[PDB]
Amino acid sequence: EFNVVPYYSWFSGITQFQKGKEFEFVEGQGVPIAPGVPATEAKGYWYRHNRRSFKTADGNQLLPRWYFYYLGTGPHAKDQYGTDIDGVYWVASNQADVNTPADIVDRDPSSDEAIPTRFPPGTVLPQGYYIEGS
Ligand SMILES: O=C1C(Cl)=C(NCCN2CCOCC2)C(=O)c2ncccc21
Task: Say how far apart CA 97 and CA 81 lie, in whole Å.
Answer: 10
CA 55 / ligand 1 centre spacing (Å): 25
The CA-CA-CA angle for residues 89, 29, 6, to 5°, reads 40
Which residue range is the domain that position 62 belongs to? 1-134
Q: Residue 40, class by beta-carbon neighbours within 10 Å (0-12 exposed, 13-18 middle, 19+ buried)? A: middle
**What kind of experiment solved this structure?**
X-ray
Structure's resolution in angstroms: 1.7
Which of 8, 15, 46, 73 for a ligand 1 pocket mutation test, highest count of atoms within 8 Å of Cβ?
Answer: 8
Decide: 46 and 67 in contact? Cβ < 8 Å.
yes
Decide: 84 and 90 in contact? Cβ < 8 Å.
no
CA 8 / ligand 1 centre spacing (Å): 6
Total domains in the fold of the chain: 1
Please enumerate in sequence order all residues whose Cβ is within 8 A of that of 17, keeping only pairs 6 or more positions apart, or say none: 63, 128, 129, 130
Q: Atom 4, ligand 1: which residue's CA is nearest?
A: 1
Which amino acid would we find at residue 73?
T
